[PDB]
Amino acid sequence: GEDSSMDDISAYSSPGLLDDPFSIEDVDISLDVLDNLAPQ
Amino acid sequence: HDIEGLKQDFRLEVGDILYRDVVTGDVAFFNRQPSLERSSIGVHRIVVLENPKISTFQMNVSACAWYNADFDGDQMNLWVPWSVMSRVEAELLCSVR
Amino acid sequence: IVESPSICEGFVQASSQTLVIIPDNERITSNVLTTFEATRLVAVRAQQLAINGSTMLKKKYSSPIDIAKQELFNRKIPLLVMRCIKVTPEGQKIVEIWNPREMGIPLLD
Amino acid sequence: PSIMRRLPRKEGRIRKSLLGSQVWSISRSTICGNSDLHLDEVG
Ligand SMILES: [Mg+2]
């Protein structure tokens, strides 16, 4: 009960945590010309 | 054949294909992304800017309504048709008129 | 009993078809070229002129596109428009043959 | 890496290589205003 060699690696981080509404996934626009989407 | 490594011919042979520079009056497809309407790709008559310090695609402000474009930093594609078949159809079908 | 596959079934090559041309008086399609058909005619003629260059146009132009346009406008273009109406299961391919020398050209010049 | 992973997403085979295309003989630049050009003309 005093051992740390085999502790869970993912448990050292903060414990705990279908379409993304803000992701342009079905919009076919080049990533280098994204300024056309600026609100202006 | 290159043009710099070939300078011994007085003229050209019939049937050859010449890849010439783009001149004023040529038609070109002119596009802005995203292409939502079918007027987002239109055919414009090219006016070649002889000033070597100009690097932008200049167009009339009244033509922005086709592409939903403005001059806050937008970038637009442009490809000049070279095939005869595609050059005919640009003038007759895809013209911005 | 539905038995093992035979050679009668399993053919990949589709059977050949017979071109059934609708008679002129029984045609239903319009007597006016669409912009798509006129553009295709002009493009095909321009490319063929770029290949061959043999034309009967009396005037002289320095571009295949202009020569093709004037040939279409002067009704001297050696092409026909075949409008595929229906492909029948028995094998027939009913089409419509239209002459662009006697149809209205929608283009402008 | 798998054969079927190449298909699905936006960067997949269908949406990037078939429905879309990388082409030659094309140019891109910032657009600009020019009141001396016709509406059917581009500088
Ligand atoms: Mg903008």
- H helices then E strands: how many in chain B? 2, 4
Q: Which residue in this structure is represented by tokens 């310090």?
A: B53
Question: Nearest CA to B29 among C45, D26, D6?
Answer: D26
Burial B35-44, CB ≥16 within 10 A → b, else e: eeeeebbbbb
Burial B50-84, CB ≥16 within 10 A → b, else e: eeeeeebbbbbeebbebbebeeeebbbbbbbbeeb
* Contact present, A and C (at least 3 Cβ pairs less than 8 Å): no
Number of cross-chain residue pairs from A and B with Cβ atoms under 8 Å apart: 23
Under 8 Å CB-to-CB from C105, ≥6 apart: which residues? C33, C38, C72, C73
**What resolution does the deposited structure have, in angstroms?**
3.7
CA–CA dist B45, A36 (Å, integer): 24
- Cβ-nearest to D42 among B44, B54, B71: B44
Which chain A residues touch D15 with a CB distance below 8 Å?
A: 28
- H helices then E strands: how many in chain D? 1, 2
CA–CA dist D19, A24 (Å, integer): 17
**Strand partners for D32:** B58
CA–CA dist B38, B31 (Å, integer): 10
Contact B75 A36 (CB under 8 A): yes
> What was the experiment behind these coordinates?
cryo-EM
CA–CA dist D3, A36 (Å, integer): 35
Neighbours of B90 (CB within 10 A): 21
CA–CA dist B68, B37 (Å, integer): 9
Using CB atoms within 10 A of its CB, is residue C56 exposed (0-12), middle (13-18) or buried (19+)?
A: exposed
